[PDB]
Amino acid sequence: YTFIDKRVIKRTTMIEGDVETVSPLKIGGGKDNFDPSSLAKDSILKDVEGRPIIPGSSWKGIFRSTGERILRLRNIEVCSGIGKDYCLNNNRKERDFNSALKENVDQALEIFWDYTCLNCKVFGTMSVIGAVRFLD
RNA sequence: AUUGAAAGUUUUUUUUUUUUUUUUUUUUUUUUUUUUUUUUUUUUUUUU
């Protein structure tokens, strides 16, 4: 039950890798302004020094969608982790979880372990922080 | 119409002076404005 409990960090895993673009890459820069010395009107997201960084949000979204596809392939039920559609809401256990938050923590942990999916318990869901952090 | 009477118990004198309801006493001790959201989809550098 250490997976959900964030009080104690009993392990720490870190992956540092290099991403090489086999195909051309275009991360949308907002298509609303071209502040730096870009090339086309639809500028990609870049640092003030011109460095075209990749947002951590994009990594998180890509990983979440790929995991959704993988779990759907493995016939494993999974939340959508977006909008008003997470299996906390789908299972109608949100009110009980909110009550348990003020109440004994063990009940909240049991609820979040039994009535919860994997993607929105790993990447995180509403009012719960995910276990994994994505950097830029 | 008394043995038979006609006299203010009155004048005069400030219950006044000395003395700060005063000294000491911090409306503070605790609480991360975080939390789930891919700037995405559509478009053949192209003809008489």
- What does A85-99 look like in DSSP terms, one character per residue? B-HHHHTT-HHHHHH
Q: Which of A88, A89, A92 is nearest to A4 (CA)?
A: A88
Structure solved using which method?
A: cryo-EM
CA distance A64 to A2: 22
CA distance A132 to A13: 9
- CB-based contact A123:A63 (threshold 8 Å): yes
CA distance A127 to A94: 10
CA distance A97 to A126: 11
Both ends of chain A: CA-CA distance in Å? 30
Q: Which two tokens stand for residue A68?
A: 């959704």
Q: Which of A60, A79, A82, A61 is nearest to A71 (CA)?
A: A79
Residue that the structure tokens 């494993």 belong to: A76
- CB-based contact A126:A86 (threshold 8 Å): yes
DSSP state of A44: B
Nucleotides on strand B with an atom closer than 7 A to protein CB?
A: 34-40
Contacts of residues A20-28 at CB distance under 8 Å and 24 or more positions apart, as own/partner, are A27/A52, A27/A54, A27/A55, A27/A58
A58 beta carbon < 7 A from strand B? yes
Separation in Å, CA A33 to CA A19, A24, A27, A74, A136: 27, 22, 14, 42, 21
Residues constituting chain A: 136
A123 beta carbon < 7 A from strand B? yes
A62 beta carbon < 7 A from strand B? yes
